Amino acid sequence: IAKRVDVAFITQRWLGGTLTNFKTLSISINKLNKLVEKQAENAADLTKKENLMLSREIERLEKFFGGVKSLKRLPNLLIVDDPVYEKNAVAEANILRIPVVALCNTNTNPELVDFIIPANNHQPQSTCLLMNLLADAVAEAKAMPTMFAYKPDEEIQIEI
């Protein structure tokens, strides 16, 4: 979904502090730009240790700050697969004023989510269908094609 639609994404969950302030996000994006445009000219000149450190820093930035490189203002929306296992960001959003839309079956606190989606994520097919539906929902805004919104077919795929 992230490689399909030009929107930011999170690979590994937040460690806290990466969403409450913009200055850390600003130094992160500056580090990303400096790292990429400097490693564009440094791949085998010195010892393998520094080049491997550059690659490791790139991979770490992908792990944590991978998707946050196209924003100048704080994210106006975020979609969560479950309030459990992602409590930090949703708690910050309660502290903040940003609206929250999230998936939750029954293991949530409905107070922490302002747009409840009682869609169970235990079965992979339902999660895939809802994720594609939301991708198509955000697709129309940027004038890009939609695939599964009114299609008379259910996404069936054996668990990998």
Partner: protein, 167 residues
């Protein structure tokens, strides 16, 4: 109450004299009637009570006066012919009136189905099946009706939400 009086003769002795002493000692009972004469044959004791490893056991079955036994108690203890005078009454934990007994079909089905007569059948003695079909100790219903109602309202949805078009 019931009276299961288990009586012991003096070790290994004859049968004729055993019946003689049994019927002689049964004369001490004051007025209680309804007993059955019984004998449990020649059994082997687990440990030597006095000197013998074998004796005759006797089981009594009757019901009557609660004060018609202490005399038998004081006569049995002193004499050497009678050794043990175990008494069971209806104080032993029990209960049945007309419907708690006929449930032996449970063990009948256990014995029948549990044993395997075919090499392709296995029915474990601890298995669940969810057999509760009808009968549920009904919830004690109690009906009523309103006579003076006022201000009817209906609310369907109550959870946190907010407006749209976040600008």
């Amino acid at each position: 109450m019931q009276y299961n009086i288990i009586l012991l003769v003096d070790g290994s002795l004859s049968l004729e004299q055993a019946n003689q002493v049994n019927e002689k000692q049964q004369q001490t009972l004051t007025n209680v009637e309804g007993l059955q004469t019984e004998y449990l044959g020649l059994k082997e004791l687990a440990y030597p009570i006095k000197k013998q490893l074998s004796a005759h056991y006797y089981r009594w079955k009757f019901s009557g006066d609660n004060q018609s036994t202490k005399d038998f108690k004081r006569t049995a203890n002193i004499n050497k012919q009678v050794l043990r005078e175990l008494i069971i009454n209806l104080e032993r934990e029990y209960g049945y009136l007309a419907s708690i007994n006929p449930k032996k079909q449970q063990l009948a089905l256990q014995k029948r189905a549990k044993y395997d007569e075919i090499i392709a059948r296995e029915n474990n003695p601890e298995n669940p099946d969810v057999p509760v079909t009808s009968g549920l100790a009904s919830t004690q219903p109690r009906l009523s009706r309103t006579e003076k109602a006022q201000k009817p309202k209906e609310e369907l949805w109550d959870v946190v939400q907010k407006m749209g078009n976040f600008d």
